[PDB]
């Protein structure tokens, strides 16, 4: 029974602070006067830094763990992994996706991830992994929020009775709404298929989260239509556009028009560096293009966007260990946000900003929030990225869920020395 | 009370010649055998060339004079210009626009400009500006024939009771129909906006000028549906598209296809070059592209097109004196059309082809027309273009509006000599 958390440090705050635990919640949190000495019913932080938990905003937990089965994607390309998925999506069963997806989730709540969007693929008649899914989003609630997203993988207009899975999907109880206009067959069924998810989502009052013109085509601009739709119905806030690498390649006057748009209609976006920087840029020769979404950009204009992981060992991303500042650091680099104070502040990608994506309430170091909260033995968001550190506690309700005892290195020269690489 | 004008020259004749006037009207116009004595109720051109009034078929007096009120475009951009527009929208009051649009009518009328078409903006649910222009119009009609086009700057279907604003415009008494379609939130919206303007346009019976592909954006083609819509409905001499920036940026075989629906269609063509220079290229680094339309092209291909000047003193262009031979000049550097005879026509792009685009009856030196015209002090339109000369003389109904007392210049070397830069 956890009361307090001890000699911890908070983002943008001076000296060490005490978290005061009651019910679950957190009751107060107080400036300390120096370091504290362990006490029973308290959790020590070290002077780590304490942060609300790793959000996860876009991973597809149905397709995890399956790369190579039974085949590779030779390209590397989004077009070849579909391809790849379909042919396993033909060999899924109820206890292999539950599986597969239980293993990815476990490596999550190790790494201090407790909310997650998974999206998955609800072109299939026999809804077999979205069952799975549902079951699976009851069975991990202790330790993680799971969101699924109902998404028709393979169109919804350019699949056989595609709406009327993508609705059942929904009946059945997913929490968002999926589309994919650049893999319809034409531009025309790309925009009619956002009427339909908008038109669903209303319909079920449920999120909305696009696959939206991942793709390097400079005509892709299906994200046009997700945010005037938002905005007509003023539903901002509930609406995600993931990927958006159409953008990278769009001319910079298209942009800023754009961009008003964006604003005015509130939708969150999502950009997902490990897997863009892998698929993106495939059918350039020299030079390549890199192929994320304009993080910079949004960042500037107070847009929201965020991080995700997207893919573990799967068609279309071929390695991965669920971990979030991983991708960040993936994302810093490739987006140039290489400021110090642009990659201290990186902690906001995969934390704040990606808990707004997902329409979250209760999120936050505060008092009356639930005791949501991970420790990261580091000084600051600069420390934790550069050093890639572990998540050293977990803490969900007051309770800990998850601990890593750090490794420990020590160079021998003319004595032992211990490196902390500080 | 004039009778006759003498000593003229006229563009593309030889010699002298005399204008005679009757009840505010041209009675004849006769050859002289040699120069003129100057005589009573006579005006003499003191051998400068006689022509039509100017023309400025594209004005904004709405926002002329607020540059800077209360904030800067600090990015030079169409898109900051509309946000800094919007924030002295809210500022507007009656008085304001009056004051204003009558500062820079008054330099328009010193100019030699008899007829202007302004552009006021509709997305206001007061529709001040538009009301205040209405009475505007009927205050200077003694001077100015001013056209007004009801313009839904912030989109027709993007703006809230847009199109409700727009028909009450036109209601109210505007006589022409603008649109803004590469400023909608999408290409959607932006096709059905000209649709819902060219229906408008039908059922009152009023002229259509659209902001038509202000952008540089290769895939802003609005211009073709302006094109097609004015074809089937028969009414291209009606129809101007303003700007077409992005034509500059086409790729040569659309544009070659485009062309043909241009001629067939008979619609009309405003480059604005002081403003297109200024606004266009933003979004590039170097090279840079100009981004004035085809002017050239439509030329070679019997196409109407003309100058305007579209901005003076604004949150889209921080100088101006209202003066279309400055126009011209800027026009002819940027689309390289430094041809003598080139410039020597210029005249027509800002006489003959603007009246033709404001569809305009009575224009032209010819008996039987009303005794419009002005007196330049030069000797053709090459001489005028080159030395960027004066107004000598504005005659309405056979009046004299305005009169510039050109400047004198001496250099005093051995001996005191004029300069007349000739
Ligand atoms: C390591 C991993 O991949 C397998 O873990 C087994 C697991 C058993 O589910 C129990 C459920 C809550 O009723 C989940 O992990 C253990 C619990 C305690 O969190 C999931 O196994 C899936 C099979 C049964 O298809
Ligand atoms: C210099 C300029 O900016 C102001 O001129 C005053 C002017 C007065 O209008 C009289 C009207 C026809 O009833 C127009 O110019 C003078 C006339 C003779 O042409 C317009 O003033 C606007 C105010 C009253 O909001
Ligand atoms: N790269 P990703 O987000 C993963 C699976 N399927 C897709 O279409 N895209
Ligand atoms: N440059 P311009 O013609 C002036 C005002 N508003 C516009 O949208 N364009
Ligand atoms: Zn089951
Ligand atoms: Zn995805
Ligand atoms: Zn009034
Ligand atoms: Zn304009």
Redesign the interface.
């Given at each position: 029974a956890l009361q307090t958390i001890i000699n911890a440090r908070l983002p943008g705050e001076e000296g060490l602070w005490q978290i005061h635990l009651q019910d679950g919640k957190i009751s107060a949190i107080d400036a300390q006067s120096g370091v504290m000495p362990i006490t029973e019913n308290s959790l020590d932080a070290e002077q780590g830094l304490v942060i609300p938990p790793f959000v996860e905003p876009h991973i597809h937990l149905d397709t995890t763990q399956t790369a190579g089965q039974p085949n590779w994607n030779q390209s590397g390309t989004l077009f070849e992994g579909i391809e790849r998925w379909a042919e396993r999506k033909a060999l899924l069963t109820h206890d292999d996706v539950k599986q597969r997806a239980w293993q990815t989730l476990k490596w999550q709540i190790a790494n201090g991830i407790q909310h997650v969007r998974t999206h998955v693929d609800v072109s299939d008649a026999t809804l077999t992994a979205l069952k799975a899914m549902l079951e699976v989003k009851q069975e991990v609630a202790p330790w993680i929020d799971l969101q699924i997203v109902a998404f028709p993988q393979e169109g919804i207009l350019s699949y056989p009775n595609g709406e009327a899975l993508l609705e059942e999907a929904l009946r059945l109880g997913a929490d968002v709404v999926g589309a994919i206009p650049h893999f319809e067959f034409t531009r025309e069924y790309g925009?009619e298929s956002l009427h339909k998810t908008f038109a669903l989502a209303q319909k079920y009052d449920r999120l909305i989260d696009v696959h939206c013109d991942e793709i390097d085509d400079?005509?892709s601009?299906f994200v046009?239509?997700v945010?005037?739709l938002a905005?007509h119905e003023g539903m901002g806030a509930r609406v995600t556009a993931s990927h958006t690498t159409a953008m990278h390649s769009y001319?910079?006057?298209?942009?800023?028009?754009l961009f008003?748009?964006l604003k005015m209609s509130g939708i969150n976006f999502v950009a997902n560096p490990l897997v863009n920087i892998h698929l993106q840029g495939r059918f350039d020769t020299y030079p390549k293009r890199r192929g994320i979404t304009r993080v910079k950009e949004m960042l500037e204009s107070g847009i929201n966007v965020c991080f995700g992981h997207d893919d573990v060992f799967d068609p279309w991303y071929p390695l991965g260990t669920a971990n979030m500042l991983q991708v960040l650091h993936m994302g810093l680099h490739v987006c140039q946000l290489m400021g110090y104070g642009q990659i201290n502040d990186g902690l906001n990608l995969i934390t704040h900003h990606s808990a707004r994506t997902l329409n979250l309430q209760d999120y936050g170091i505060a008092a009356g929030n639930s005791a949501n909260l991970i420790i990261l033995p580091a000084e600051n968001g600069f420390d934790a990225l550069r050093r890639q550190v572990p998540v050293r506690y977990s803490v969900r309700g007051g309770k800990v869920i998850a601990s890593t005892q750090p490794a420990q290195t020590t160079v021998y020269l003319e004595q032992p020395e211990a490196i902390d690489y500080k």
């Open positions: 925009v400079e005509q601009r046009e239509t945010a005037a905005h001319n910079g006057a298209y942009t800023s028009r008003r748009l």
